[PDB]
Every structure is written in C-alpha cells, then in structure tokens.
Amino acid sequence: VELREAQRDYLDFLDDEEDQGIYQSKVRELISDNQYRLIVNVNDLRRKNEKRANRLLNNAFEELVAFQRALKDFVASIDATYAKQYEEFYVGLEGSFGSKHVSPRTLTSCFLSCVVCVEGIVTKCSLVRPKVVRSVHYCPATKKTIERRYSVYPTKDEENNPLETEYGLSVYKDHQTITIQEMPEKAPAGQLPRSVDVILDDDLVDKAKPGDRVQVVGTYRCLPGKKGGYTSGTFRTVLIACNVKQM
Amino acid sequence: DEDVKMITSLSKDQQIGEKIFASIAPSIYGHEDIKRGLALALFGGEPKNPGGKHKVRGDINVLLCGDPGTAKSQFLKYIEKVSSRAIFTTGQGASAVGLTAYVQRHPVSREWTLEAGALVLADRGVCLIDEFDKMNDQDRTSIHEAMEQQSISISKAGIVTSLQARCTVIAAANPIGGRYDPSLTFSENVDLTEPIISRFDILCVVRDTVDPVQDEMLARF
Numbered sequence: 482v483e484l485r486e487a488q489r490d491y492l493d494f495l496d497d498e499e500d501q502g503i504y505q506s507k508v509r510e511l512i513s514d515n516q517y518r519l520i521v522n523v524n525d526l527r528r529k530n531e532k533r534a535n536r537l538l539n540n541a542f543e544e545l546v547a548f549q550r551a552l553k554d555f556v557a558s559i560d561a562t563y564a565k566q567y568e569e570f571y572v573g574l575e576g577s578f579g580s581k582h583v584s585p586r587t588l589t590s591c592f593l594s595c596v597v598c599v600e601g602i603v604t605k606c607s608l609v610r611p612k613v614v615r616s617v618h619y620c621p622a623t624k625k626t627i628e629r630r631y632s633v634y635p636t637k638d639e640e641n642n643p644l645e646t647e648y649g650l651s652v653y654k655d656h657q658t659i660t661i662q663e664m665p666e667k668a669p670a671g672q673l674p675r676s677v678d679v680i681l682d683d684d685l686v687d688k689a690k691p692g693d694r695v696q697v698v699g700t701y702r703c704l705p706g707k708k709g710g711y712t713s714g715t716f717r718t719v720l721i722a723c724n725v726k727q728m
Numbered sequence: 729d730e731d732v733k734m735i736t737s738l739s740k741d742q743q744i745g746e747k748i749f750a751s752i753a754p755s756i757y758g759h760e761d762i763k764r765g766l767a768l769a770l771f772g773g774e775p776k777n778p779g780g781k782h783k784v785r786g787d788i789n790v791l792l793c794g795d796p797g798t799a800k801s802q803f804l805k806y807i808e809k810v811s812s813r814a815i816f817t818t819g820q821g822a823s824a825v826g827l828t829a830y831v832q833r834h835p836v837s838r839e840w841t842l843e844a845g846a847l848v849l850a851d852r853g854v855c856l857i858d859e860f861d862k863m864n865d866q867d868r869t870s871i872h873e874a875m876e877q878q879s880i881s882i883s884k885a886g887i888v889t890s891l892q893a894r895c896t897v898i899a900a901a902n903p904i905g906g907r908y909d910p911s912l913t914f915s916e917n918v919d920l921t922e923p924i925i926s927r928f929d930i931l932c933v934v935r936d937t938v939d940p941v942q943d944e945m946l947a948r949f
C-alpha cells in the first residue's frame with residue numbers, strides 16, 4: 482500500500498506540462514539525446530511535496546525503486562518504443578540537502594540507508610570491469626537454448642550433454658570503484674585524512690579521474706558479513722553513487 | 729632518620745665545602761676548578777617565575793673545551809656514575825640513546841612507539857654530551873630549542889605534542905685546529921656558534937702545556 486501510494490505521488494510529480502513544468506521537455510530531450518538518466522532537483526520536490534522528500538531522504542532504496550518504476554511508466558506512456566531498448570532507468574539528484582551535506586570526516590552511522598552528498602578529491606581508481614546480468618546457453622547435442630537471470634554458472638545439460646556459452650547473446654554492464662579523500666585545504670592541520678569508497682555503474686564509470694575535485698550524491702549502505710559460522714559484528718560501509726559532478 | 733642527623737652534623741663542619749670539592753673525581757688528578765664547577769652544577773639553583781610571564785631557569789650548564797689527552801671523558805663518566813638520573817650520549821653517532829624524538833616500531837618489542845630524545849628522558853636530571861662539535865643540524869636545532877625554550881615540540885605521523893626537557897647539560901669538546909690558540913678568542917677556536925655558547929653558564933678551557941713536575945706526578949699516578 483505504501484509503495485503504491487509512493488509510486489502514485491511520484492507519477493503525479495512528473496505531470497507538470499499544464500503547470501509551467503520543465504520535466505516533460507527534459508524527458509523529450511533525453512529521448513532525443515539517447516540518454517536514460519534524469520536529474521531532478523531536490524528543492525523543487527520539497528517545494529511540491531515535503532513528505533515525499535523527507536521519506537526519500539530518510540529511506541532511499543524503496544523510494545528510489547518506486548521513482549524508477551514511475552519513470553519507467555512515464556517513458557512508456559510517452560514512447561513505449563524507446564523503453565524497449567533498456568530494462569530500467571536510473572535517477573540523478575541535485576539541490577541543497579542541508580544537514581545531509583556531509584564531508585568524509587563527518588560521515589557516521591546516523592546516515593545509514595539515507596541519501597548523502599559529499600565533496601572531495603579522487604585518489605584511487607580501478608579498471609572498468611563488466612558484470613553479468615543475463616546468460617544464454619546452447620546445447621549442440623539437443624539443439625536447445627536456456628536462459629538465466631542474475632540479480633551458480635550452469636555447465637551441463639540434464640542428460641550431462643556439454644553446454645556452449647553464447648557471449649554475444651549475454652548482457653553485461655560496466656562497473657568501477659573509486660576512492661574519495663577529504664580535501665587538504667579543509668582538513669585540520671596535523672591530522673591524518675579519512676577516505677570513502679564509491680561504486681560507479683552504467684554511464685557514470687568514466688566521469689572521474691584521480692587527482693580531481695568532485696561532488697558525489699548517493700546512498701550510504703553497509704556490506705553484510707560474508708559467509709561463516711562466526712561473525713565479528715562489524716560491517717564495511719560503501720557509498721553507492723547516483724550522480725557525480727565536476728565542481 | 730640517623731642519616732639526616734649525620735648530614736646536619738657534617739654541615740656544621742667548617743671545611744665541608746672544601747671536602748665536597750675534593751671528593752669529586754678521586755681518580756682524576758688536578759683540575760680543581762673543573763671539579764668545583766661540576767659541584768656547583770650538580771647542586772644547582774632555584775627556578776623563578778613571577779606570575780606566568782617571566783620564566784628564569786635554575787640549571788647550570790657546563791661546557792668543557794680541551795686538547796686531546798686531558799681526560800675530558802672521565803669527568804662525564806664519573807658524573808654519570810654519581811647522578812641518579814643521568815643520560816650519556818655522543819655526537820659522533822651510533823649512540824645507544826638518540827638525541828631526536830621519532831615514532832617507529834621498536835626492533836625488539838615490535839610495537840609502535842614514540843621514542844623521545846635524551847633531553848626528554850633526562851627531565852629533572854643530567855644530560856652528558858661527548859664530541860659536541862661532531863653533531864649534525866638536527867641535533868644542534870634540538871639542543872638549541874631544549875636550552876632556550878626548555879621544551880621539545882613534535883609534529884610527526886599525525887601526532888602533535890609538546891614535552892618538557894628540564895635538564896642540566898654538560899658537554900665536552902675539542903678545538904678546531906686540534907690545539908687551543910691563546911691569541912684567538914674562545915668563539916673562534918670552537919666550531920660552535922655564538923648563540924649556542926651563550927647558553928652555557930660555565931666554560932672551561934683545558935691546555936696541555938709541558939710542566940715537568942706535573943707530568944712526572946701524572947705519570948706516577
């Protein structure tokens with residue numbers, strides 16, 4: 482019920498053409514420019530719906546999923562032809578967050594599952610790597626094709642017949658990891674710096690380079706303890722970015 | 729308890745000062761003035777601080793400069809033996825105790841430690857320096873700041889500290905040319921700078937003039 486109401490509110494937010502809105506023109510430009518990411522100002526959403534903005538800031542994952550679903554529905558309604566190419570769209574955020582504008586030094590557990598904005602410098606970057614989404618396999622012995630989705634790699638048929646992988650039919654997405662360090666111009670003198678880890682996916686992979694000053698908006702989450710009968714009770718925290726800006 | 733009474737009785741002696749002066753360095757022949765100055769340094773004075781603005785120290789630093797073969801190191805060894813808290817070091821190098829503070833993993837204990845210089849370890853004690861003219865820039869700067877400000881400031885590996893270094897410094901040195909020249913001043917005969925020399929309260933000059941009777945007595949001893 483809550484998710485459906487949030488989706489309804491998000492759908493109502495976008496239909497602003499009869500209210501001097503700009504987002505319809507933005508979506509038209511995105512379709513024209515073959516882009517699948519939309520940037521929405523947090524200030525405008527707060528002006529139009531403060532409760533939805535508060536819920537999104539205090540709870541990110543579910544609200545972001547609902548907003549992506551709403552954007553999918555909106556793009557479908559505009560031109561379902563374009564929506565066929567991509568499975569889902571992605572959301573970008575902009576504006577003044579206020580209390581959630583947090584430097585790497587001031588990041589704490591109080592901001593878990595929330596949307597935060599950080600400003601820093603890039604020190605470490607990793608090579609771009611593909612990640613599997615779907616897999617297609619073929620059996621020359623029986624001329625049968627099987628499909629698998631990911632969110633175990635099959636190797637043999639039911640009758641132990643060998644399976645051959647079709648790399649071209651599979652789906653891959655880009656992935657990269659970067660590190661952000663507090664700017665020395667603002668860090669206290671005589672103290673060691675503190676760093677945060679950020680994950681970039683899809684079209685945001687190649688938007689950062691080491692030695693550059695950037696501003697990143699994204700969700701703050703923990704990583705669960707890996708498999709084992711005993712756990713230390715300490716989880717690593719990694720930022721999942723949704724928008725990167727060159728200041 | 730009886731020791732206090734014995735000390736008070738000894739103080740009533742009319743020649744207690746001469747006895748104390750002659751007691752220092754029994755194995756060293758001659759150099760009465762050096763022994764007297766070392767006694768004065770050992771007994772020390774009294775620091776003063778009107779309010780929290782004007783600080784005046786009470787430590788008596790001693791510098792000895794002399795020709796080779798005048799037994800300068802024996803006085804330092806005797807002072808190290810006598811003093812309850814005495815730290816001995818040499819400026820040549822490979823000293824057991826360093827003169828500059830640093831943060832490092834100890835080779836033996838394998839633990840992350842902050843090791844201060846000999847000046848800090850000698851707080852309210854005595855610091856003896858041999859080969860005072862062989863020191864490098866870091867040791868000279870550390871000694872200068874420990875003698876002027878009586879404190880050491882450390883800013884290393886994210887650690888910012890200030891440590892007290894209230895100590896009495898006794899140093900030994902040799903002339904630039906290997907032999908003291910009376911025609912030149914003391915400053916021109918030593919590789920040290922004037923501000924460093926100005927810190928020492930007592931400066932002693934030792935020469936190796938050929939006196940047959942003194943040489944005969946020294947050889948007999």
Ligand SMILES: Nc1ncnc2c1ncn2[C@@H]1O[C@H](COP(=O)(O)OP(=O)(O)OP(=O)(O)O)[C@@H](O)[C@H]1O
Binds near residue numbers: 796799
């Ligand atoms: N007045 C003295 N009485 C007894 N021994 C003496 C006297 N003067 C010098 N010596 C002897 O001279 C020797 C020289 O060694 P010593 O370490 O004392 O020299 P030093 O003056 O420190 O020399 P250097 O300039 O090379 O550092 C010693 O074995 C010491 O016993």
Ligand SMILES: [Mg+2]
Binds near residue numbers: 801858
């Ligand atoms: Mg010597």
